[PDB]
Structures are given as structure tokens and as C-alpha cells.
Amino acid sequence: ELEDFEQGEKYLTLTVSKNDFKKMEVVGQFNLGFIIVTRKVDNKYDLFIVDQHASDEKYNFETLQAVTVFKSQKLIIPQPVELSELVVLLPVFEKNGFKLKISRVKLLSLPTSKQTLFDLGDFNELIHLIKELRRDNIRCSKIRSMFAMRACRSSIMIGKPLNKKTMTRVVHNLSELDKPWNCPHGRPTMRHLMELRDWSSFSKDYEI
Amino acid sequence: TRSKFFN
Amino acid sequence: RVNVNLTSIKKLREKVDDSIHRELTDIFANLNYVGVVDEERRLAAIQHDLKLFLIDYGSVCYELFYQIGLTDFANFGKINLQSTNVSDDIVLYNLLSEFDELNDDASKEKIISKIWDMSSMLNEYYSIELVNDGLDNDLKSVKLKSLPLLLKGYIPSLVKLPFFIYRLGKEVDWEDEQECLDGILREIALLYIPDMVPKVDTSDASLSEDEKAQFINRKEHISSLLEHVLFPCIKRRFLAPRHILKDVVEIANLPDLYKVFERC
Ligand SMILES: [Mg+2]
Ligand SMILES: [Zn+2]
Ligand SMILES: [Zn+2]
Description:
The complex is a heterotrimer. By secondary structure, chain A is α+β, with helices and mostly antiparallel strands. Chain A contains 7 helices and 6 strands; from the N terminus they run H-H-E-E-E-H-E-H-E-H-H-H-E. The N and C termini of chain A lie far apart (51 Å). Chain C is an alpha+beta fold. In chain C, the strands form 2 sheets. Chain C has a 4-stranded antiparallel β-sheet. Chain C has a 3-stranded antiparallel β-sheet with strand order 4-6-5. The relative contact order of chain C is 0.20. Chains in contact: A-C, B-C. Chains A and C meet through helix 1, strand 1, strand 2, strand 3 and helix 3 of A and strand 1, strand 2, strand 3, helix 3 and helix 7 of C. One zinc ion is lined by residues 54, 57, 152, 183-185, 187 of chain A. It is classed as hydrolase.
């Protein structure tokens, strides 16, 4: 049944551009969990269904990934490291709580949290994550996971009644992101409902 | 019945 | 209050009763209004239980106003169309001037003559009040003073008044009591359907500033009309005829949606 999920995300990558979102219009809220939207551009007229939580979350998440400077623990005695890979070590390390002094590398600060421990395996993970484009928003899995939970907890809840103003912001915000088809947990943000091409509606009132 | 207007 | 002893109205009420779709009527009786999809094509989205429907409200309002007309026949309230501004009056001859095929004063006068001779009944039965400002025979001075008030909180747009008069004068079979009565109720219902609002491009810098806020205002007035006046009435009293199944379309269902959209 997962093929129906794949073709949905495949359709979105071709049918929906960054600008397409800015021109989308909110129809209303469906079952207190969905935003029904229209998109009419050129000869294309389609309805899309947006998940209010997942779409709000993908925005908050991507914002945290790009802007947040993670808090670090200023080390008591600096620790060295050997690489090769040395040319990769970018101020993406400073954003991830790695203040450095630059095989002769010097680790001045390590990121810290009251709910998790950070090590050299995370610094090397971030060294390998750059190997796999935009590199300024790259985060080590530990940090990424924490931002994914921050976004999930702060975002619009399913079952929350929303007004046009809020729903409009939620949809339009998606134009700021690259291919925002999924939330950080891999859940879909939106899907195409139907194309409104040939709907020959009632017109008797203008007929003579 | 029938309408007065239609006679 | 007036009891309709008439045989014509009863036959038309029975005809409505014979077309009632039980299941489709339940869908409207328990609708949960979502919003407007297209103000031009007149499509609205509603939720019924686990399904999302696309409705053609042009078609639904048509049957709704037709049904209201049938029920309140000879007991309608009035929408008084006249102000202290005499220049704002609605002249039937002036309305028929929108039709280029009525290329002579006489052809427009032909239509006004039929309508005008039937003014006593149009007023009594339908609350469609016509008045003459000058001498009785001056068809060019025949005016529309009142229209029937079908729904409290609703005043129809008068953009379609030319069509109302043209069809009253050309489409209504004035010779047969039942066909005439049905015809007038159909004309009232047609005029009463909210207007088609064509799409205007808000992104186009080529289109004027005043044309924008004016489209936005028409877009808002319908959304508010459908949401606060129309759909609550549809939900409360609408009897769905079987010929309307083509106008109600299931577009999504929660069981299917919840197989793609899942919790984080
Ligand atoms: Mg039901
Ligand atoms: Zn979440
Ligand atoms: Zn998520």
C-alpha cells in the first residue's frame, strides 16, 4: 500500500513550486486537523489537503535547524583530534556547540544539554554528515532529534480550531522551505486532493 | 380549488 | 395568515415530495460546513460524518429557494426596494435594455405588458409588487417596488434583475395556472441564487487597486452569506431531490486520509 504514499510525494515535487504556496487559498478547516486549500495557476486548478500539525512543525523545525546556536560547555583542558577531512572543519561546528582552535585540531567547547551527553563520536558524526547543496543548516542526529521534538511540542495541535488568518500563515510559510513534503518524523505535510478542470456547474440563472 | 386570476 | 386552498400549489408540493432523496437529504441535514472552493463555479466544501463533499451551491440554493417559495406561497414578507432617492428606482424598460435582441421599444413593451397585466396576482401570491409612476398605460414608467422575502437575513443581489424580467415575460407560460405558478416560483428561485463571482488575479500589477479590494469584498460577502445565512438554512430545512446527486461529489474520506497522514 506504500506505493500510494510514494506517488503522492512524487506528484508534489513536479506539481508544486515555492511560489505555488504563496498563491494558495484557504477553503477552510476539515475535521479540526486539516486545511483544505485551492491552487489556481494558469490552466491548472487543484485542491490540496494540508495536515495542520505536520506542516506547522516542518516550518518551526527548519527554522530551528537554520538559526539556532546550540549551547556549549567551555572545556577545562582542550582536547585534540586527528583527521586527514581536515579541510571540512565551516562555522557549522560553532552552530552545533563546537568552538574550535585551528593533523592539529583543538576542541575548546562541546555542546551541552540537561537531557543528553555529547562526545567525540558526535563531532565525527557531524564531520561525516557534511560529506552527505545547503550545509549551513546541517545538524548532528542528537541535536536534530532535539529540534524535531522542540518543533513537535510547540507547533499547532491536531484538534485545535483555526481561523483563516492562522491557516493562511501555515500554508504560505511552506513557500519558504525546500520540498516541504514531510515533517522531521517523515509524516506527510500535504497531499493533492483533486484537479478542478471540467466541473460544469449550474448556470440556469444566466441562461435565456 | 382554482385561481381567480386564471379564468 | 392565508391557507393555500389552491389545487396548483398542492400538485407542485407533491412533485417535490416524490423527488426527495432520503440519503442525500440526511447528508444536508447533518452537514458540517468547511468553506467556499470556487465563487465563480459556485462550489462549497462540506463534511458529512467521515466524508468531505464538494457541493454546487448554485444548484442547492436553486432547489432551496424553490422549496421556500412553494411553502410560503401567498404569505411572503417583502423586500422594500424603494428609497427616498427616486433616481434609484427600478424601471422594467431600463432593465430590458440590457438585451440587444429586444432591438425595438415595442418588443421590451411586449414583455412589460404581460407582467403588468398580472400585477394584481404577482403582488397577492408572490409579493412581487409593480407600480406605475405616470399614466396607467405608460409601460416605460413601470417600476418594481417590492420582491418576496424568502429568508430572514438574506437580500438577493439584483445583478440578475434583467434576466428575471426577461424570463418572466418570455419563459413563464401565463396561460396555464399550474405551469404559470411553477414558472414564477422558478424565476424567483433563479434570481435568489448568490451571484457567480468571476476570478480576478490579485498578483497582476496591471489590474487597478480599486478592482482588487472590490473582488476581495465580493469574495468576503459570499463566504459570510454561505456560512451565516445559507448553509444554516440548507442544514435546517433542505429536502434533496434525486436529480441533485450529480451536484454533490465525495472528494475524500477520513479512513483513507488517516492511512497517509499519521502522528509524529
Ligand atoms: Mg448522516
Ligand atoms: Zn509532531
Ligand atoms: Zn513530525
